[PDB]
Enzyme design. Structure first.
Site, short mmCIF file in Angstrom:
data_model
loop_
_atom_site.label_atom_id
_atom_site.label_comp_id
_atom_site.label_asym_id
_atom_site.label_seq_id
_atom_site.Cartn_x
_atom_site.Cartn_y
_atom_site.Cartn_z
CD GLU A 11 -72.35 62.41 28.77
OE1 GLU A 11 -73.07 63.39 28.50
OE2 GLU A 11 -72.20 61.96 29.93
CB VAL A 17 -66.80 68.29 29.26
CG1 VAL A 17 -65.69 69.32 29.54
CG2 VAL A 17 -66.74 67.16 30.27
CD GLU A 76 -54.59 73.50 33.21
OE1 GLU A 76 -53.78 74.07 32.45
OE2 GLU A 76 -54.23 72.89 34.23
CG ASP A 122 -63.04 56.17 34.75
OD1 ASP A 122 -62.66 55.09 34.23
OD2 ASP A 122 -63.99 56.82 34.31
CE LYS A 124 -62.85 57.60 31.13
NZ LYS A 124 -64.22 57.07 31.26
N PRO A 125 -57.43 57.12 28.03
CG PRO A 125 -56.53 55.91 26.22
CD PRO A 125 -57.38 55.75 27.46
CD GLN A 126 -62.95 58.33 25.84
OE1 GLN A 126 -62.86 57.34 26.56
NE2 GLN A 126 -64.07 58.67 25.21
O1 TIY Z 1 -61.34 68.45 33.06
C1 TIY Z 1 -61.91 67.74 32.18
C2 TIY Z 1 -62.68 66.70 32.76
O2 TIY Z 1 -62.72 66.57 34.12
C3 TIY Z 1 -63.44 65.71 32.12
C4 TIY Z 1 -63.64 65.51 30.77
C5 TIY Z 1 -63.13 66.25 29.70
C6 TIY Z 1 -62.27 67.38 29.68
C7 TIY Z 1 -61.98 67.85 28.36
C8 TIY Z 1 -61.16 68.96 28.12
O3 TIY Z 1 -60.92 69.34 26.84
C9 TIY Z 1 -60.60 69.65 29.21
O4 TIY Z 1 -59.79 70.73 29.04
C10 TIY Z 1 -60.87 69.22 30.50
O5 TIY Z 1 -60.25 69.99 31.42
C11 TIY Z 1 -61.71 68.08 30.81
#
Ligand code: TIY
Length: 293
Positions: A11, A17, A76, A122, A124-126
């Protein structure tokens, strides 16, 4: 429709996502769905501009889809994010050469974005994504600029404040590129010590955690601070903590670089370009991480 929706991989700040396979190309991608008044046209053009942004350290934005009065971003796909990797690595720590490689790559990515007049705001590790090849890439910019920043994430999710620059917390209306350097400094410290540097549970707790560590800012170290919109003269005055207590046992090159990324005055805070020149990176290499997918 044209995708298999492999799975929901999270989320996100602007929406859910998914991992999805393109039935046409066989391509595996990350699909982000964004929030319904019919949407602004401004954001669409701005975001569309981002497709043009291309750099090995930035997650490629492949397509923007506005159809059916909905907005999807097609990115990607990368298999793992830094938050997950740090958790996986918490027993032994991430090796310094890999920390250094990741920081160096992230600064290259920021230097690129910033020279193109694009802010993340924004970090952050995530939102830092990694692969088996030793690469790390910046994702999910928003853009919080093309969009805007309401109360929650999407539906009842709690925004992480841990990486927010002090000027944002003090109510500065105009962000600069310095906000990204601050966040990346916080992430650098977290890779090193294996715990978040400033884990605030509220805006004021976030601010006071910063002050308790770096000292309550004043006009000496941050000219103009006492005029900031949310500044109150009633803020407690904490003494700055000796810096060697903050990210032990990082060496003086690393501590010096971190201190420059954490300057209170956004104008004194080191630029990504300048940071790449710091002596900390003299010995930088590109190690392979051990990734379990
Ligand atoms: O672009 C992403 C994004 O803008 C936001 C959040 C999570 C993501 C998670 C992934 O695994 C990924 O390949 C991503 O390419 C994203």
């Amino acid at each position: 429709e044209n995708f298999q929706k492999v799975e929901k991989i999270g989320e996100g700040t602007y929406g859910v996502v998914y991992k999805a396979r393109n039935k046409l190309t066989g391509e595996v991608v990350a699909l982000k769905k964004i929030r319904t008044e019919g949407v602004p046209s401004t954001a669409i053009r701005e975001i569309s501009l981002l497709k043009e942004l291309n750099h090995p350290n930035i997650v490629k934005l492949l397509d923007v889809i506005h159809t059916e009065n909905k907005l999807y971003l097609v990115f990607e796909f990368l298999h793992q994010d830094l938050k997950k990797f740090m958790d996986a690595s918490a027993l032994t720590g991430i090796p310094l050469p890999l920390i250094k490689s990741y920081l160096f790559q992230l600064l290259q990515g920021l230097a690129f974005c910033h020279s193109h007049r694009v802010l993340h705001r924004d970090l952050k590790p995530q939102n830092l994504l990694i692969n088996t090849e030793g690469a790390i890439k910046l994702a999910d910019f928003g853009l919080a600029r093309a969009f805007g920043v309401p109360v929650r994430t999407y539906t009842h999710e709690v925004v992480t404040l841990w990486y927010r620059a002090p000027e944002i917390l003090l109510g500065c209306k105009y962000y600069s590129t310095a906000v990204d350097i601050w966040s990346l400094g916080c992430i650098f410290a977290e890779m090193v010590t294996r715990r978040a540097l400033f884990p605030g549970d509220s805006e004021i707790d976030q601010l006071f955690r910063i002050f308790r560590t770096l000292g309550t800012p004043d006009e000496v170290v941050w000219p103009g601070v006492t005029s900031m919109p949310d500044y109150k003269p009633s803020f407690p005055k904490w003494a700055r903590q000796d810096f060697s207590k903050v990210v032990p046992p990082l060496d003086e090159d690393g501590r010096s670089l971190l201190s420059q990324m954490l300057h209170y005055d956004p104008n004194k805070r080191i630029s990504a370009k300048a940071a790449l020149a710091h002596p900390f990176f003299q010995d930088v290499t590109k190690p392979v991480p051990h990734l379990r997918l």
